[PDB]
Design a protein around this nucleic acid. Structure first.
Length: 91
DNA sequence: AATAAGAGGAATGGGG
DNA sequence: TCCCCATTCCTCTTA
């Protein structure tokens, strides 16, 4: 099954939900969620995973925070903004 | 207050 | 057995 960070990277590469997520500085791997349209993206994540409950942005970001220690995705000190690692971006 | 982002401990669930 | 990779629930903090 696809990992959350790869789901997000794939959306950014495909442009499929441009009103929900976008690059801020693509060369640095920083990206930002839409305040108003992030829930539709969270719903898509849960449906893709076949999860029992409806996915929410809060639960998706709870998972995102678990990448902080291993490095794939880190929170940036800007609203709704995160950053992929160079390793993640190289693949 | 109302709204909302940010956080994480802890329990619970996936699929090896 | 016990780690993988989350998901779900709950409470607290910050803006």
């Amino acid at each position: 099954k696809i990992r959350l960070y790869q789901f997000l990277l794939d959306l950014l590469r495909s442009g499929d939900m441009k009103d929900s997520i976008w690059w801020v500085d693509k060369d640095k791997g920083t990206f930002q969620f839409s305040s108003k349209h992030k829930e539709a993206l969270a719903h898509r994540w849960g449906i893709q995973k076949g999860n029992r409950k409806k996915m929410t942005y809060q639960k998706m970001a709870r998972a995102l925070r678990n990448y902080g220690k291993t490095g794939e995705v880190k929170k940036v000190k800007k609203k709704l903004t995160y950053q992929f690692s160079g390793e993640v971006l190289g693949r």
